[PDB]
Swiss-Prot record, chain A:
The lineage of its organism: Eukaryota, Metazoa, Chordata, Craniata, Vertebrata. This is Immunoglobulin heavy constant gamma 1. It comes from the Eukaryota. One of its GO terms (cellular component) is plasma membrane. Immunoglobulins are composed of two identical heavy chains and two identical light chains; disulfide-linked. Interacts with FCGR1A; this interaction mediates IgG effector functions on monocytes. Interacts with FCGR2A and FCGR3A. It is linked to Multiple myeloma: A malignant tumor of plasma cells usually arising in the bone marrow and characterized by diffuse involvement of the skeletal system, hyperglobulinemia, Bence-Jones proteinuria and anemia. Complications of multiple myeloma are bone pain, hypercalcemia, renal failure and spinal cord compression. The aberrant antibodies that are produced lead to impaired humoral immunity and patients have a high prevalence of infection. Amyloidosis may develop in some patients. Residues 3-102, 111-207 form the Ig-like domain. Constant region of immunoglobulin heavy chains. Immunoglobulins, also known as antibodies, are membrane-bound or secreted glycoproteins produced by B lymphocytes. In the recognition phase of humoral immunity, the membrane-bound immunoglobulins serve as receptors which, upon binding of a specific antigen, trigger the clonal expansion and differentiation of B lymphocytes into immunoglobulins-secreting plasma cells. Secreted immunoglobulins mediate the effector phase of humoral immunity, which results in the elimination of bound antigens. GO terms for molecular function: antigen binding; Fc-gamma receptor I complex binding; immunoglobulin receptor binding. Signal peptide: none annotated. It comes from Homo sapiens. The gene is IGHG1. The chain holds residues 119 to 326 of 399 of the full protein. Disulfide bonds join 26-86, 132-190. Keywords: Adaptive immunity, Cell membrane, Chromosomal rearrangement, Disulfide bond, Glycoprotein, Immunity, Immunoglobulin, Immunoglobulin domain, Membrane, Secreted, Transmembrane, Transmembrane helix. Residues 106-208 are annotated as: CH3. Glycosylation on Asn-62 is required for interaction with Fc receptors and ability to activate the complement pathway. (Microbial infection) Deglycosylation on Asn-62 by S.pyogenes EndoS or Endos2 endoglucosidases prevents interaction between immunoglobulin-gamma (IgG) and Fc receptors, impairing ability to activate the complement pathway.
Amino acid sequence: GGPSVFLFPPKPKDTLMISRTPEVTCVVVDVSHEDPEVKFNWYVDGVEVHNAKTKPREEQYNSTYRVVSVLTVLHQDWLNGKEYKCKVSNKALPAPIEKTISKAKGQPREPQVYTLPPCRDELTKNQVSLWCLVKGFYPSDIAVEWESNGQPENNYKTTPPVLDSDGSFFLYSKLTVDKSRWQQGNVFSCSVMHEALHNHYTQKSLSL
Amino acid sequence: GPSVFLFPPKPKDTLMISRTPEVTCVVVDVSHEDPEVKFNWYVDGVEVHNAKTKPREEQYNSTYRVVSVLTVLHQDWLNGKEYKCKVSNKALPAPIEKTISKAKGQPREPQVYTLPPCRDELTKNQVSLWCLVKGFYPSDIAVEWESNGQPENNYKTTPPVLDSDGSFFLYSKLTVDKSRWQQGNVFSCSVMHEALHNHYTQKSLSL
Ligand SMILES: *[C@@H]1O[C@H](CO[C@@H]2O[C@@H](C)[C@@H](O)[C@@H](O)[C@@H]2O)[C@@H](O[C@@H]2O[C@H](CO)[C@@H](O[C@@H]3O[C@H](CO[C@@H]4O[C@H](CO)[C@@H](O)[C@H](O)[C@@H]4O[C@@H]4O[C@H](CO)[C@@H](O[C@@H]5O[C@H](CO)[C@H](O)[C@H](O)[C@H]5O)[C@H](O)[C@H]4NC(C)=O)[C@@H](O)[C@H](O[C@@H]4O[C@H](CO)[C@@H](O)[C@H](O)[C@@H]4O[C@@H]4O[C@H](CO)[C@@H](O)[C@H](O)[C@H]4NC(C)=O)[C@@H]3O)[C@H](O)[C@H]2NC(C)=O)[C@H](O)[C@H]1NC(C)=O
Ligand SMILES: *[C@@H]1O[C@H](CO[C@@H]2O[C@@H](C)[C@@H](O)[C@@H](O)[C@@H]2O)[C@@H](O[C@@H]2O[C@H](CO)[C@@H](O[C@@H]3O[C@H](CO[C@H]4O[C@H](CO)[C@@H](O)[C@H](O)[C@@H]4O[C@@H]4O[C@H](CO)[C@@H](O[C@@H]5O[C@H](CO)[C@H](O)[C@H](O)[C@H]5O)[C@H](O)[C@H]4NC(C)=O)[C@@H](O)[C@H](O[C@@H]4O[C@H](CO)[C@@H](O)[C@H](O)[C@@H]4O[C@@H]4O[C@H](CO)[C@@H](O)[C@H](O)[C@H]4NC(C)=O)[C@@H]3O)[C@H](O)[C@H]2NC(C)=O)[C@H](O)[C@H]1NC(C)=O
């Protein structure tokens, strides 16, 4: 079979919040017992970097090894579209495998953020749905959360971003809670994090 | 050797007796040595005699693409009959078999609401009209817009999104000229789904 390489980006929230630590993760699977050594080289815009942290290989339940290398990235490097390449060498390969990742090309556009009460018809159910519209953003990378009185909610589903005709993206998030609370008048908050926002963050609330 | 992928028919094609719903068997990476590809189709075991094979197709990456298309009875697909593509090639280790069928479970009727342009867009050249469609099952659905019978096309629709009760929702966004909205033109969001009466419903709005 021969090894395979997957290269994963940082989470958008981690590149947008200076307090978080964004990482790019290069994962090698199907490493054989006969040729277990795996070498990583990393490059940032084709210049070799030497600060990645590579973990000991780990035997999987199918008897092949998985080996992961992690490169921490500067938030502003990632946001300035630098390109991260992982090159993986292994004696079982005819040649080194390379993977490159970077954020989405294109000019950024600031999302417009709106919230919406439950469909008035829903106003007798066990539960109600709260909506958050996010539209006109570019690039597609974004995080959307819900909180109440500074507490992370979690019963929400968010559509993927949808490419709009204008080249910008939109999506909706739908938080579902107890009928009680919305009348009770608790205040719910939709949080959006995106590179084209001021402080990369904005939040819209609503209640009864 | 080559890969097999087997694709369902389109939701709309199953819901309107005037349309011709098809399952579609695609083979990639067919070389020239054994360009020889055979298909057998079966519905719920019983073999049937009507699939059609396309004129085949080359990618400049050095290989072919060979498609067999079988037309289905609408009611059969909707009742969940299984559809099997059996693919034979003098270049495969063994012949490959794929089954597909409609998502299982009790159909649930969508709820459709249209919503007017936001807030601040009225200063713009253009406005967005919205259609929310929620609570449906299975996820096979078609959503379309029109104005005075005329179909629009300047609209985009999120994919179905799985909700926590195991039903689905989506939104569709139609972009129009501020001028067309303001003259009180009527816009309609149309939804086709097996759990609706006549598989069809339409919701309207205007200034
Ligand atoms: C040489 O090149 C070949 C061709 O490349 C292209 O060719 C042209 C165009 C050229 O310009 C090139 O630039 C192009 O790259 C290579 O062929 C490609 O092979 C790969 C596999 O290696 C294919 O990938 C698969 O894609 C399907 C999705 O289906 C397609 O969508 C893509 C993207 O849109 C598209 O490319 C194809 O067109 C397919 O589109 C659909 O086709 C159907 C077929 O008819 C259309 O439906 C029909 O439409 C009609 C009218 O349109 C009627 O209505 C009819 O009724 C209807 O049926 C439909 O319009 C169209 N849809 C869309 C959206 O476009 C993947 O799903 C598929 O499975 C995957 O499997 C992976 C593992 O193998 C997995 O990791 C993935 O997640 C995925 O799914 C998983 O896998 C399991 C097993 O498969 C599943 O069981 C399971 O669900 C799931 N896993 C889990 C855990 O859930 C696969 O990835 C690729 O599409 C090929 N491209 C083309 C154009 O055919 C070739 O490889 C290469 N060779 C070499 C040697 O280098
Ligand atoms: C033997 O075992 C190993 C290991 O498996 C385990 O053990 C076995 C015994 C069994 O028990 C398993 O159940 C166990 O899991 C098997 O290894 C597996 O190998 C397959 C390939 O054969 C890989 O499949 C790929 O998967 C990726 C998706 O990645 C993730 O998501 C899954 C869950 O869905 C996870 O299980 C994975 O771990 C991985 O999870 C992500 O991991 C990253 C890295 O850590 C995390 O990111 C970091 O997170 C940090 C915090 O945690 C921080 O945020 C960091 O900054 C961040 O970097 C993620 O958070 C985490 N995500 C999740 C949800 O957990 C999938 O993308 C691959 O996708 C495809 O590529 C294939 C080619 O195979 C194409 O067919 C498809 O198109 C598809 O995508 C396209 O691919 C092309 C390139 O080919 C790409 O360029 C295009 O962009 C794509 N196209 C499009 C249109 O988009 C592929 O499916 C498994 O990932 C791997 N598992 C593990 C655990 O590594 C091995 O296969 C077995 N061997 C044998 C012989 O059987």
